[PDB]
Each structure stands twice: as C-alpha cells, then as structure tokens.
C-alpha cells in the first residue's frame, strides 16, 4: 500500500479571493408603508427573515478594508440609484429666470442677509398668459447679476436641475447585502480588529447586517459603534493624505433644528407641473443650530485622545483645530434632517489642547436649498421646503480626522476634520466584511481503486 | 440552545476542521452552490454566471470517471514530488485551505493525467466489448 491513487472531491470547503456584484436586500417592514416613499422599496428583494451566521473554528483569513471592492460597488450603486430616483420628477428649466429681489421684512441691523424675497414672472397652465409671483430664497442660492437689485439662481450658469418629489423621502432604510450563489461573505468578529491583517475569529454569513445609508462629512452619524473601547483606524498612520477614521464606544447625542415656521406654497410652472416655494415666515426669524452635551463631548474627546497617544508616543500634545478651508460642504458639517440639508459650523467642538496629564455647546447652521452632492457635471437638485418647524435627533457614531505636518519636529499633532471622498463614510461599516469565491473541486490522495 | 453539531451540518462549517472530517458534511457545499430594470439585468447576469460555473464544473467532472459522484476513485498514481507527505498527516492534521496552497502548481498536470486515464479507459472498454 505504498502506492496512493488520486481521488477527486466535489463540494470541498475551500475559498479563494474574488470580486463580484452583490444584490441588495431591504427589509419587508418598509413594504408595509408602500408606494415609492423611500428608494428601493420596489427595486430591491425582501430579505430572509431568518439570518443565520455560521461561526467557523481554527481559521485565519486576511482582511483589508482599504483595498476592499464592496465599498466601491456600494458607492457606485447609491449614485446610480439616486439618479434613478429623480427621473420621474419635474425638471425646473422654466424657473431659471431674472429675479427682482428685496430684503425680507425684518429689523435689518446692517449685519446679515440670509433670506431674500424675490418676485419674478412665471408661466401658467396656459402657454400664453403669465403671472407675477414671489418666493423666499436663501442667500446661498441667488447671485447678483449686473432701484431694487436684480438676481438669478446660481445653477442657471451651468445646468437646470430636477427638484425632488415630496412623495420621495430621503431617510435611510437599512440595506443588507445577500451574497449570490457560488460566493460567500465572511465577517470578522475580533473586537480588537485593527482594520488590516488577520482576524483569527471569522464567521461566514449569507447576508449582511443592517446598514443605514446616511450622508455626512465632518462626523458620521448613526454608525454602528464599537463595543469594548473607542477605536481608531488608518492605512499608514504616518501618511498625511489618508484619513484617520475614529469609531466611538459611547454615542454622543446631537440635537438639530430649524426654528423658522415656513409655509409651503404651490406654483404651477406648467400643466401637470407644480413648484413648491417658501411662501411666508410666520412666527419669527431665528437661525438654525445644533446642540451637543458639553460634558459628554469633553469625555469623548478624552477617550479619543487616550487612544491616539498609543500610535504617537505617550508624551505629545494632541490638539484639535477647525477645518483648513475649501468648498462649503467639506469644511462645515453636512447632513439631512427631515428632508432639508443643513450645513453646521463645527469650530465650537474642535478647539482644545491635551497635555500628558449641564451646559450644551451651540453651533450655528446654514441651509442651502439647492445641493450638488457627489459633484457631477450638470446635475444638482432643488430640495423643496417643508411645512413647519422640524427637528431631528441623532447618535454620533464616529468622526473623520486628518493629521498634518511638514517638518520642524514639534511635539504637537494637530488634528482637523476631513470629508472629501464620500467612500470613507462607507468604510466604517463594511470594514468587517469580505467576499470570497468557492472552488469546490479539490483533489487528494487516498488508498482506493476503481473496479474495471 | 441550537447545538455545536449544527455548525458542522451548516454551510462551510468544516472549513477549519480536518480533512478526515469534512468528507461527511461535504454535500452542503455542493447543494448551496446552485440554488441560493438595470437591477434585473445585474441579478439575472449574476445568476446565469453561477449556473454556468456549476455546469462547467459538472462537465469537467463528467469527462473523468465520476459523472454523478461526490467521492471518486481513479487510475493514475501520485508522483512523489507532488506533496511527499504520508497518509496520516494529510487526513488527520491538515485543513483543506492549507492543502490547496501546497499543490497549487501541479493541478493542471493532474487534470491532464485524469483526462488521459479516462480516454484510455474508454478505448480499453471498447476493445473489451468489441470481441463479444
């Protein structure tokens, strides 16, 4: 029996790394409130109501979230689907017209604009007639083209923009990723998983956990938080161009609002097309803001400073600065709240210093009605105003940082907020996953023959 | 409680267990391999890619001596330079992931030898039944 005869085996558990498309699976509970309310309530399969992970044993798979392909497929799929949820809505070509604007009725102090009362001609249901109509636009949407002044919208120089139908909600619903046939999805479970390298306790799973898609720049919200302690993640920490993601342990709470009691008003641009304009401000003119608890925020910065001293030496001076500059929605804090896009100045959180040994922070917010997210060539959208005072409450899951330094050996390490690419917001929720391909045909020796 | 044995009858549970214990639960990876307007095209294309991969593997298994068998036996001997390890350590110690990355260079040679073996077996069977 010194001879060994080769035997094949079909259905052997052994995988090799590969990349493929993944189909999304939204939960069927969103189907109970039907009729296109959020996206992918029609363009998405319902889930298995019985998810079943299968904890493996004595197994080591190398994970690397930075060279992952699933985050890139998600960044493509959200853009393509977000464009697919604007084509039935009304294009706002005819509203791009010369505006005659004045100040809103207010005790103007001679130091702020921030609202404009713009009258303009507009077509009617019939093609022949026309109507004078007034609206209220923000100052970040009108530009003085060169008596009362004479303005135009800012998108008119490059591209007309579809407004969003108010039957379509902007709020996230959890998106699962069920793997197709032939492939599988692994999952790290090590609580001290750095981000790159071996995770010595993996678990295969047929469909991923609840991923709610938020859109935010300075500090990501409602993001699955780590369990044992606050963690930081990077690719090369001694590199400057790569962001330094941070995931919290305790969710610090933020409250945001808009005190102006609006009045939504319908204008018929064309037959079958209606335009929604900010009609009147009853109540009082009060600026939008956000509040976090000062004590918990000082404690949470104490935790992240305790964590950052490991990678940099125990005797360094970690200090936090505000953003260096750039466009609007990378310096300020961008998010959506009830279907209306805020931009909140965050210099009031990011100023401190840290040496080796009740109230609440207010921070102002500015609002745009038109938005250009993902920075395409000729697509913006006009987010319509919403009736009444709105507010929304959110847990802060983590924040995105950025180190800087040129030379001259100083002990300080100034950190500033980041943003930039939208993909970093997804790399804080697809870090523990990896897609694999089954190769079920393996071959091995044993003692047997086949009988002729 | 569910029980830890439900791990082994589960999908891919034997991936860390030894090679002598994955052969009992080897049919679950075989069974869960097949079944499981732009989005319709993506999902349709992925599903037909999966069934083309399964059909390619069944055709490559059928031109050997085992068209519908999970376990099989052949008629070609192991060159000793392939893995030079005895029987007890490659069926009680090693895992399949480690075994796949120890013979990864020699696999096309094995497939060619199996094709030659089945071809000569077919012509020998035809010569045996030709005389009757």
């Amino acid at each position, epitope marked *: 029996a010194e001879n060994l005869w080769v035997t094949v085996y079909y259905g052997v558990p052994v995988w090799k790394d590969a990349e493929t498309t993944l189909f999304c699976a939204s939960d069927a509970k969103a189907y109970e409130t039907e009729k296109h309310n959020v996206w992918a309530t029609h363009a998405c399969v319902p889930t298995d109501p019985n998810p079943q992970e299968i904890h493996l044993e004595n197994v080591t798979e190398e994970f690397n979230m930075w060279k992952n392909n699933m985050v890139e497929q998600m960044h493509t799929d959200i853009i393509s689907l977000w464009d697919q949820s604007l084509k039935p809505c009304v294009k706002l070509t005819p509203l791009c017209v010369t505006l005659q604007c004045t100040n809103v009725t207010n005790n103007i102090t001679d130091m702020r604009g921030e609202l404009k009362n713009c009258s303009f001609n507009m077509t009617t249901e019939l093609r022949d007639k026309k109507q004078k109509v007034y609206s209220l636009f923000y100052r970040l949407d009108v530009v003085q083209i060169n008596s009362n002044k004479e303005y135009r919208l800012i998108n008119c120089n490059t591209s007309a923009c579809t407004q969003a139908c108010p039957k379509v909600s902007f709020e996230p619903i959890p998106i699962h990723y069920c793997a197709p046939a032939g492939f599988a999805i692994l999952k790290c*479970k090590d609580k001290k998983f750095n981000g790159t390298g071996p995770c010595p306790s993996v678990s295969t799973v047929q469909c991923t956990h609840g991923i709610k898609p938020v859109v935010s720049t300075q500090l990501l919200l409602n993001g699955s938080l780590a369990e044992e302690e606050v963690m930081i993640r990077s690719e090369n920490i001694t590199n400057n161009a790569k962001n330094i993601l941070v995931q919290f342990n305790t969710p610090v709470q933020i409250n945001c609002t808009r005190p102006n009691n609006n009045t939504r008003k319908s204008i018929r641009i064309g037959p079958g097309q209606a335009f929604y304009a900010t009609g009147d401000i009853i109540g009082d003119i009060r600026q939008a803001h956000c509040n976090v608890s000062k004590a918990t925020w000082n404690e949470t910065l104490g935790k992240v400073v305790k964590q950052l001293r490991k990678h940099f030496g125990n005797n360094t001076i970690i200090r936090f600065a505000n953003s260096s500059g750039g466009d609007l929605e990378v310096t300020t804090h961008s998010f959506n709240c009830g279907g209306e896009f805020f931009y909140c100045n965050t210099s009031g959180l990011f100023n401190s210093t840290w040496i080796s040994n009740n109230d609440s922070i207010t921070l102002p917010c500015r609002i745009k009605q038109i938005i250009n997210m993902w920075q395409r060539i000729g697509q913006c959208m006009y987010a319509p105003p919403i009736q009444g005072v709105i507010r929304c409450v959110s847990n802060i899951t983590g924040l995105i940082l950025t180190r800087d330094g040129g030379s001259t050996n100083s002990t300080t390490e100034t950190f500033r907020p980041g943003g930039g690419d939208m993909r970093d917001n997804w790399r804080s929720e697809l870090y523990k996953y990896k897609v694999v391909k089954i190769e079920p045909l393996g071959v091995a020796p044993t003692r047997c023959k086949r009988r002729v | *409680a569910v029980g830890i044995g439900a*791990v082994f009858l589960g999908f891919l549970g034997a991936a860390g267990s030894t090679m002598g214990a994955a052969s009992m639960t080897l049919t679950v990876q075989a069974r869960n391999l097949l079944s499981g307007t732009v989005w319709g095209i993506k999902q349709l294309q992925a599903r037909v890619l999966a069934v083309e991969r399964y059909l390619r593997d069944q055709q490559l298994l059928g031109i050997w001596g085992c068209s519908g068998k999970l376990i099989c036996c052949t008629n070609v001997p192991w060159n000793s330079s392939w893995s030079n390890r005895n029987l007890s350590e490659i069926w009680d110690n090693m895992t399949w992931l480690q075994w796949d990355k120890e013979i990864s260079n020699y696999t096309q040679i094995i497939y060619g030898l199996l094709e030659e073996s089945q071809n000569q077996q077919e012509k020998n069977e035809q010569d045996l039944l030709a005389l009757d």
Partner: antibody
Amino acid sequence: LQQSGADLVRPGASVTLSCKASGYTFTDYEMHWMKQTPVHGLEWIGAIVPETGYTAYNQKFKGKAILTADKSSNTVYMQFRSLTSEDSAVYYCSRLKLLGYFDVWGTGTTVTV
Amino acid sequence: DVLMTQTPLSLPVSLGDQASISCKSSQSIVYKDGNSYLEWYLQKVGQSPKLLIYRVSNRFSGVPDRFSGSGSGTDFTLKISRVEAEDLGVYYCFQGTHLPYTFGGGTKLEMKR
C-alpha cells in the same frame, strides 16, 4: 453524571479534569463547559462532538482549554494550560440535544489557584 | 459578540407577589427554525443550575406553573406568579444561536422584612 473532585493548582500548571458520562450514549448527546465567576457570572467555554472529534471554543479560552473525550469508556476530559488566580470558579458539565435544551448538569469541580 | 445585561439585579419580593426581570439582546436571536433560542436559568445556591422554561413558550418538565416568559425577538422578560422559599437563587438569561453562548449577569431574589 459522574465527575472529578476539587483541586489545588499552582499558577503555570496543566491540569486535566474529567467528568465521565454514564448511561447515555456518546452518539446522541454533546457536552459543554462553564465558568461560575463572582463578577462575570456565567461564561461559556467549549464543546465536544465525540463522533466528529473537533469543535470550537470561546475565543478567550482557545489555547488554554483543550477538550478530549474517550468514547469507549465515555470519559470527557478538559485540559487547562498556564492557569491564573482568576480561575476560582465552579465548572459545570452539561448535556445537549440537537436543537435542544440542557438535559443534565454536573455539580462542579472548583479549581482553587 | 452578543453579550447581554439584566435589568434589575436583585429584587427582594414578598411571598405572593409578581416579579419581572428583563434581558435585552444586542443582536436579534433568530435561527433558521424561527424560534428564538433563549433559555431561562435558575440556580439554587450550592447546586447545579436548573432550567426554568425553554425558548419563550415551552417549559422544562419537572417545573411548576408559577413561571411565565415573554418577548418579541429583541428584549425578553419573565413574570413569576407566586413566590416561594425555593425561588431563592440566582437567575440567568442564556442564548443558543451564536457562538460563543452569552449569559446574563444573574439576579438574586430575596426576602422582605
């Protein structure tokens, strides 16, 4: 339901503690192990399927805890390695059914380090 | 890991009142069966721990009907109808789906005077 007794263990010593199964067959039932700590309460350790011969553990206790079983005599052996003074707890044999509950339970073999 | 907590931690309840303790699950506990595999444990002091009920609804044989349990996948609780002296002990919540199997903290029902 048959067990070992309590021990007096030095730090850094490898001790094998058994509870042997009597009456019920090894092909049907599957054991587990436990810890009764006065701070963390109860914790899970591991398991044995004696037919297949290898299962997993709790990820804190891999390496230290190794579980072997002799199916002929039906004697189920733990093995610990490099014990600490923290392992003063009560260790419980337990029995499971497939998709099933805990049938029997051991009294306990305290390891006073 | 799917560790749980127990709210509250100790209830001295008189002989003949209703006691109710909850365990909250981080991840959902759903198997391919559909039934949420959670067990309720009681342990009288110096003994082996028993089983109070099964999943949410079924009951361990050899246990009286002074125990009831409720839950809807995410957060679970009990209701004890009448209190005895044997109902002294330490209670636990146990999971049965994912590895490693987690426990609750442990509650000690006491007397009132």
